[PDB]
Enzyme design. Sequence first.
Site, PDB file in Angstrom:
ATOM      1  N   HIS A 185       0.866  -1.334   0.136  1.00 22.85           N
ATOM      2  CA  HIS A 185      -0.006   0.089   0.050  1.00 22.85           C
ATOM      3  C   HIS A 185       0.883   1.176   0.016  1.00 22.85           C
ATOM      4  CE1 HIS A 185      -3.766   2.220   1.346  1.00 22.85           C
ATOM      5  NE2 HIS A 185      -2.886   2.974   1.680  1.00 22.85           N
ATOM      6  N   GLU A 186       1.675   1.314   0.898  1.00 22.94           N
ATOM      7  CA  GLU A 186       2.889   2.779   0.920  1.00 22.94           C
ATOM      8  C   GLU A 186       3.543   2.952  -0.387  1.00 22.94           C
ATOM      9  OE1 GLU A 186       1.757   4.439   2.937  1.00 22.94           O
ATOM     10  OE2 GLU A 186       0.972   3.080   4.486  1.00 22.94           O
ATOM     11  N   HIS A 236       1.323   4.160  -3.034  1.00 19.09           N
ATOM     12  CA  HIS A 236       1.229   5.712  -3.082  1.00 19.09           C
ATOM     13  C   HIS A 236       2.329   6.125  -3.705  1.00 19.09           C
ATOM     14  CE1 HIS A 236      -1.971   6.609  -0.899  1.00 19.09           C
ATOM     15  NE2 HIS A 236      -1.641   5.970   0.251  1.00 19.09           N
ATOM     16  N   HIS A 287      -5.890   6.752  -2.690  1.00 20.27           N
ATOM     17  CA  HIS A 287      -7.033   5.667  -1.905  1.00 20.27           C
ATOM     18  C   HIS A 287      -8.238   5.360  -2.685  1.00 20.27           C
ATOM     19  CE1 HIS A 287      -5.098   7.062   2.080  1.00 20.27           C
ATOM     20  NE2 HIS A 287      -4.604   5.895   1.617  1.00 20.27           N
TER      21      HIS A 287
HETATM   22  C1  LIG Z   1      -1.840  -0.063   5.343  1.00 18.58           C
HETATM   23  C2  LIG Z   1      -2.955   1.046   5.646  1.00 18.58           C
HETATM   24  C3  LIG Z   1      -4.070   0.934   4.656  1.00 18.58           C
HETATM   25  C4  LIG Z   1      -2.429   2.467   5.558  1.00 18.58           C
HETATM   26  C5  LIG Z   1      -3.169   3.626   6.251  1.00 18.58           C
HETATM   27  C6  LIG Z   1      -2.499   5.011   6.426  1.00 18.58           C
HETATM   28  C7  LIG Z   1      -2.251   5.439   5.155  1.00 18.58           C
HETATM   29  O1  LIG Z   1      -3.178   5.377   4.312  1.00 18.58           O
HETATM   30  N1  LIG Z   1      -0.890   5.219   4.947  1.00 18.58           N
HETATM   31  O2  LIG Z   1      -0.551   5.553   3.667  1.00 18.58           O
HETATM   32  C8  LIG Z   1      -3.665   3.188   7.465  1.00 18.58           C
HETATM   33  O3  LIG Z   1      -3.090   3.108   8.566  1.00 18.58           O
HETATM   34  N2  LIG Z   1      -5.124   2.818   7.896  1.00 18.58           N
HETATM   35  C9  LIG Z   1      -5.488   2.929   9.316  1.00 18.58           C
HETATM   36  C10 LIG Z   1      -6.075   1.752   9.608  1.00 18.58           C
HETATM   37  O4  LIG Z   1      -6.966   1.330   8.719  1.00 18.58           O
HETATM   38  N3  LIG Z   1      -5.908   0.804  10.297  1.00 18.58           N
HETATM   39  C11 LIG Z   1      -6.547  -0.192  11.208  1.00 18.58           C
HETATM   40  C12 LIG Z   1      -5.871  -1.413  11.316  1.00 18.58           C
HETATM   41  C13 LIG Z   1      -7.787   0.006  11.720  1.00 18.58           C
HETATM   42  O5  LIG Z   1      -6.943   0.462  12.685  1.00 18.58           O
HETATM   43  N4  LIG Z   1      -8.860  -0.424  12.039  1.00 18.58           N
HETATM   44  C14 LIG Z   1      -9.078  -0.325  13.708  1.00 18.58           C
HETATM   45  C15 LIG Z   1     -10.398   0.695  14.192  1.00 18.58           C
HETATM   46  N5  LIG Z   1     -11.123  -0.026  15.243  1.00 18.58           N
HETATM   47  C16 LIG Z   1      -6.359   4.014   9.896  1.00 18.58           C
HETATM   48  C17 LIG Z   1      -5.432   5.605   9.585  1.00 18.58           C
HETATM   49  C18 LIG Z   1      -7.476   4.343   8.734  1.00 18.58           C
HETATM   50  C19 LIG Z   1      -6.787   3.952  11.093  1.00 18.58           C
HETATM   51 ZN   LIG Z   2      -2.331   5.240   2.271  1.00 19.13          ZN
END
Ligand SMILES: CC(C)C[C@H](CC(=O)NO)C(=O)N[C@H](C(=O)N[C@@H](C)C(=O)NCCN)C(C)(C)C
Ligand SMILES: [Zn+2]
EC number: 3.4.24.86
Length: 255
Positions: A187-188, A191, A197
């Site tokens: 994913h990173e 980007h 996204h």
């Molecule tokens: C590999 C992932 C897709 C990267 C992105 C952050 C990002 O968009 N960077 O390029 C992420 O951390 N998503 C996090 C995320 O999805 N994490 C999880 C594991 C999540 O925490 N869900 C838990 C909520 N109860 C956010 C910021 C959305 C909380």
């Molecule tokens: Zn991202």
Amino acid sequence: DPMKNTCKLLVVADHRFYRYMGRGEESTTTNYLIELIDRVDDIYRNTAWDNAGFKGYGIQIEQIRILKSPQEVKPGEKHYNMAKSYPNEEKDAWDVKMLLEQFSFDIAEEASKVCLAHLFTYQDFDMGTLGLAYVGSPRANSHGGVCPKAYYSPVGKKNIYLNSGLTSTKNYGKTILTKEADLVTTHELGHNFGAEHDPDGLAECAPNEDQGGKYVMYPIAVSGDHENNKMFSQCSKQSIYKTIESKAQECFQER
Ligand SMILES: CC(C)C[C@H](CC(=O)NO)C(=O)N[C@H](C(=O)N[C@@H](C)C(=O)NCCN)C(C)(C)C
Ligand SMILES: [Zn+2]
């Protein structure tokens, strides 16, 4: 060039990753990162960015740096490999955006020599974040993502490149799964390669579970349990295609 199809990488494992993922062992750390980049590369190489023959594009490690101990820091200074987190020492981790920026500052010289630089760390970024990366673009003057294209830094006296991204394998006070860590980095890097996204809706870029699930550029981390989870959506493909076709001749190399 079908030949200039590889984005050479500078992979950096900080002291935290070395300690908590690598067992304090250089061989173990190195091997983990070589193997993860190779699994990520299988995804990229098999993607047909134009849904036809524009495939075989991926990533290779050019150099790996294992930082076995934290960077000693003078009062007031900071370094991405220091022992304490920044700006808030009490937290488990740095502010993620500031760590990406710091990493790019400190590794600027080496980043200028590769297509992309990626930092592997082990720290629990606030609110569930797993990684971060600058977005690439086909734009000539693009600053971000694939191919080092300098910003001048008054303070440092030198050129800095935003051809960087980072992945943490700690989240919510645990080590994430191996399949999860491959999806973060995919994913990173995605980007860096030009992808934004995936949006929800009519576009077909965020399918329901019954249709294979979400694609790897979904903003909410996919589990890796579903079919689409490790692939790129059409929205991602359009974006990256445009980027690679414009930038591959500039900085991609032979595999
Ligand atoms: C590999 C992932 C897709 C990267 C992105 C952050 C990002 O968009 N960077 O390029 C992420 O951390 N998503 C996090 C995320 O999805 N994490 C999880 C594991 C999540 O925490 N869900 C838990 C909520 N109860 C956010 C910021 C959305 C909380
Ligand atoms: Zn991202």
